[PDB]
Amino acid sequence: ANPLYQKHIISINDLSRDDLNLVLATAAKLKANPQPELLKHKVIASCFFEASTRTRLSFETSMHRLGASVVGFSDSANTSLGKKGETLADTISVISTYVDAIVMRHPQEGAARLATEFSGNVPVLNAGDGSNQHPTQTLLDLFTIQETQGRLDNLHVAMVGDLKYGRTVHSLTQALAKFDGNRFYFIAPDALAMPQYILDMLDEKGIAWSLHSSIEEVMAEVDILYMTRVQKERLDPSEYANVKAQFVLRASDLHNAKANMKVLHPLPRVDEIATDVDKTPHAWYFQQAGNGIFARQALLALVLNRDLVL
Amino acid sequence: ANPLYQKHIISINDLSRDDLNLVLATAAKLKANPQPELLKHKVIASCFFEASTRTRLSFETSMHRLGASVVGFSDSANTSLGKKGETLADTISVISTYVDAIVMRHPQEGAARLATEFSGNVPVLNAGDGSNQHPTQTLLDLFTIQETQGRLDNLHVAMVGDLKYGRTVHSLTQALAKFDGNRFYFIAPDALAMPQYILDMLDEKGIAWSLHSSIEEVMAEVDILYMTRVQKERLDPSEYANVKAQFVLRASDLHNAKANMKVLHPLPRVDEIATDVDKTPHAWYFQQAGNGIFARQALLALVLNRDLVL
Amino acid sequence: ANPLYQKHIISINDLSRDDLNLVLATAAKLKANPQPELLKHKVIASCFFEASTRTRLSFETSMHRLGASVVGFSDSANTSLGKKGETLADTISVISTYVDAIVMRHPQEGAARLATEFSGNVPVLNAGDGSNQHPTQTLLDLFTIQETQGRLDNLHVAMVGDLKYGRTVHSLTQALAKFDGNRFYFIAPDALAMPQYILDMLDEKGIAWSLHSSIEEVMAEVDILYMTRVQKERLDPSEYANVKAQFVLRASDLHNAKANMKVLHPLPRVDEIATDVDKTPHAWYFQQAGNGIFARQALLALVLNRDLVL
Amino acid sequence: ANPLYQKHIISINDLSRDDLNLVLATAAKLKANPQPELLKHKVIASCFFEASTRTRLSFETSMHRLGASVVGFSDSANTSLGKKGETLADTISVISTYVDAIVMRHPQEGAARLATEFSGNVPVLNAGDGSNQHPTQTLLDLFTIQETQGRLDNLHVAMVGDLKYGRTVHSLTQALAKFDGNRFYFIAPDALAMPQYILDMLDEKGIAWSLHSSIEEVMAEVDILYMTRVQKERLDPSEYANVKAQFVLRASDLHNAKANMKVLHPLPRVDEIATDVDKTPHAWYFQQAGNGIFARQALLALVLNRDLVL
Amino acid sequence: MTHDNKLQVEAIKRGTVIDHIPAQIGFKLLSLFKLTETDQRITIGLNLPSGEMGRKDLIKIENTFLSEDQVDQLALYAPQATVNRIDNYEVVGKSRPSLPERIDNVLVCPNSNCISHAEPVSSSFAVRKRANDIALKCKYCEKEFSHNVVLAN
Amino acid sequence: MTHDNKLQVEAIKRGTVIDHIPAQIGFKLLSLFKLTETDQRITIGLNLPSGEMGRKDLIKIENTFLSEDQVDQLALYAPQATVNRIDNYEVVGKSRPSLPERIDNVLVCPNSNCISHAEPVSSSFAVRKRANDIALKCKYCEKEFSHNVVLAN
């Protein structure tokens, strides 16, 4: 069957470079030649125990552009399951008798991995688990990097913002470190810098990285600028408003950027990216959210279909 | 293509008499000869940032009787998007990469019009925006008036209740003033009367109107009686309970009504219409809510299909 | 024994001119020589079933400046009474079993008067019952007119703002009509006009009033300018802002005000009186709030004392 | 008249060494012979716009032990002020119209200082303004150091915990730098380090400090060990637990503590000081809280009294 | 180059001169229409002793010709003004403002539930009914207000 | 005479001339310090040629003697601006801005939780040149920021 046929998609750590390439290869075919009746008669459950409108809607629109049905929920301060006394294990054990696949986002880390031990042979796909993993975000980021730059190796990638707690930036660095020659520039407030584990990993593979202080410092060499949002709560309002002449992106700062340089942001972007960046050629955060559809179509198609010729 | 093919449906002001007739002509064909696989493979987003169960369900049942898929939400004190810091413009910009059309109801006026500038060429349909517009209500009212009376011109239409703030009664008067010869009777508590703008418009076109004090005063000449609900909060409990021997409708009051006179109410009808009116021939508020299906099927079909032969 | 001894102060319509003057002459003495132990050993209940901080803190402070102990609750933050199904008659029959007077605010009109049927002869003083009465706010307003103008008769009093729902403008008009030769100027938007029952009472007593739509039509003649807040809930967003929001006093409008003219406002003032008015000698809204201390002290003193030697 | 007579106690940076010693010598006398009627007939407002039970109950009890009456609110449970749109300037201009001093806690920094522009000459005592100051907690800590150590100079003071966001460690460091020859040992995880502006002030005054990462590096030399609580919100779940949660004092670590060494903690302590420490003679956190009574009594006495005979 | 003086300052080589600005509207105009973000030499005379208004304001912007639609955005604030266009020390053009059909960006919808407050859109008002007194309708909320009301705030 | 500079010079009789306003601060200064809120003659020149110091701005305010404290305020914006009083057709005092003790009114606290944002208060900051920068401490929140963080916002 394909390598991922009914396999669980829980951590990017668990997927080899070849699996990442298979997903990104499929997503480019589904983007080119749609197959709207591919999962006809499958019912997927969209169990968002934690609410995320943009992630839930990208996923359910993936399910529906391949023809599947959707049952599910989002529990912001509401809706019965888990409850208290109702284990996650018993929720899964019961829902895996109803559906053909489970996409779930949950607030405690490893919830998706616990699910895997109770879903029978129903596959579970992680849409976010606490501060651990969010593999379908990384898959769409890499699809956006591959589709704009033409390759996933030998890139000068700048990562900016809360590097300490952006889950997406920890994942993207693992992933990009399965390909070759990538150079990393990490621009963070030192209260919010890369954990030494990402950094220690990167040196065992020999990957080059540098820490900088402002994007103006690397603007000129950079292919992908990946901005992350800075979490107001983890900072005092007065240090948050104090950091240099900031680390926000304005079109003035881009006047130096390479012609193929692209600004990606997992979104929301409250103020780290101004409105004028939106109209430069380098703005790519909204096209990046449209590629979410193609990345998650690819994962669902490969998981639920044995062989897929497209 | 048809006149409305991928056009935005934001204000009744923006649709000519001919467009209103095209919609009402289509809705009568969709009511006669169903086409359940007309929007097959389209995904519509039902973004109710403001909850309205009856409007949301009429719309999603429209989407589904034409075969479309639905992703969406209703945010009563819950669900992530807009948030604070997350602009409506960025919600639309992101969702218009996922779907083929956006139906949305929002609490601030003009939200649907702002959406139009961010949805790309994805059409947006207004399901309510603050106290400004609700075009799909007016379309179903006119379909109900056309289907019961046989015409939309030369009608004696009585409007009753909170004329000052019923958004539906402001819209219905614009709309009915695009056809000819209509006479209007406005029965309101003077704390809650027609704005002078509806009235000033009506006189520039030469349309006849009179203000009355009780339905008993016009019962005999009237073809459509359109009751609106009276908003308890905008009144003191003691003036609310004091108004004459009321302006509520009972079957006793109908003993005079013309045989083809019809009582319409956008609903809910807490107490302005008693239970006994429900069984007279003149009660038409529930059939009026069933015509909602046919009106919104017509708008969706025309917007998303180029040419439609039915 | 003084006339108010052990009376319930429930409504302004129950207090005669003589009653009004006796309270105001006592307030003037307590303001002049304190009597900090007059209510020694008395315990008073401050039951605010509806929260009102401003009013509660004045009432309790003036209980404390005469030596009384205070027990009680501010609720509208579920502090346990009304649970199980305790009628107000029962709550008041248990609280009158151990306090010497009840001060009480409640959301429904008539609640203080009912308390009066269950309190034995523990006096009930009303601090607000829904949209009905508030005697203690009219007593302090009157005291502030008297003390700054030297009289309560032959006044030219303008009332500006929402005259339809402001329960304090209604009561101060009823109180001032107890006195002679006062002239009223009402300046209200059309939707917030002074009700008929007030106007009709003024006519029947031969008192002069007129409607004006600008304060500067009347500035020159005016002694007390009593401003009210328009609650924007009572209008819509656009109505409030449209022409109607010019019931706002700026310092420049006071150009030609009589040297004795005073601006009064029960408070919160949000924007109907601009900040620059405060520096003028005519601003008396805060000194008016300070006078709530002597009018509330006087009522407690007169009600709990047989004979008051002054 | 004493120097503090009718002063606003807003910040520790405004009180001189002499001011600090005068308060502490008064606290020592009131602790020794009570003066339970010194503030007889004074009424004080205890406005806690942000709830803080511990602090409110100390402030009110010490108002009660000098004979003052208290009126006021604990909010952060919607008790009506701030509704309509009452600015804090206006709330304080009405409350200063009838109380003799305002004690006040508020969520925003600077709020007590602003109250000072509107209170006339009713003293404002700050009980916490956001992350800025808390003078009365530093006055009681100082009093407890003085009273147990016999001096406020030549001390070896260790500060352990979250030194970055603990507003009390920042202030006690500024107060102790008013005095001579004190030595500071800071023991903080890397993310919770003592800010530069503190460190820079210490350097500029020639005062000695050092960073250590274990309490047992310094136990032997230490006189006051001032522990703070790490709020786990400030870190992630795993960070808090990983190596960093060893800022926890157990009884065994006190093995070689000087006989005079005292452990202080503003409280709540949740787990940074283990329960078995309480039986040691060095545990002084609760006796420290008892001393908040005499330091708050002294400030009220010195501020409301011209001449204090002791 | 020609003999300036300041009571009515003189001649720029080519550019625009907006003269007979009411008084205290000149700086309002510089603020609102961001006329200041040019590297060109701008000369401005404020509260000046002349044409009948008595005092009046004046702005001279060398090397920029703003016109037709720009001159018309000036009509709500300075309708009496003349907008001289100069080439080679001579007034080759003398224009006046007339009411436009649209006023973008400069106004603020007085309706507080309007969505335009919070978002990266420009304000826009449809204009109507010349000199008996102007109504402006928001593009977004479609509420029609009185110009003096939007113009207050 | 001509090596153009002046051309029919707006020589004023009595007033203050603020010269060398270092380009683009010229308009800031008017708005911020509300210098047009007067009825006397102002003549403003923007982006003047001043080959000798690049490009500059210059405000001339008649019969007005903006001073001492008022002059020191401008130090944060136009640190090299020379004010010149004039009592009778020439310079009778040329004064440079010195960094002041406090900067009131004009400036905003970066601290979003600082109470100065929602309230009827005039901002105030204590000024301190920590040679390299100037730190500004808010009166209210007592937080201290790089003058550059404040002057962005």
Ligand SMILES: Nc1ccn([C@@H]2O[C@H](COP(=O)(O)OP(=O)(O)OP(=O)(O)O)[C@@H](O)[C@H]2O)c(=O)n1
């Ligand atoms: N090269 C020139 C020529 C004229 N002006 C300005 O052009 C304005 C008006 O042009 P003009 O028709 O020459 O004088 P008027 O006849 O007074 O124009 P109007 O009657 O419209 O005021 C004057 O204010 C003058 O400052 C100028 O600055 N530069």
Ligand SMILES: Nc1ccn([C@@H]2O[C@H](COP(=O)(O)OP(=O)(O)OP(=O)(O)O)[C@@H](O)[C@H]2O)c(=O)n1
């Ligand atoms: N009758 C006068 C005299 C002087 N000024 C102005 O006052 C300023 C004073 O500069 P000045 O001492 O006359 O010679 P400068 O070299 O220009 O002074 P600086 O060193 O500041 O460049 C000049 O801009 C000039 O326009 C004026 O308007 N009217």
Ligand SMILES: [Zn+2]
């Ligand atoms: Zn609007």
Ligand SMILES: [Zn+2]
């Ligand atoms: Zn501040």
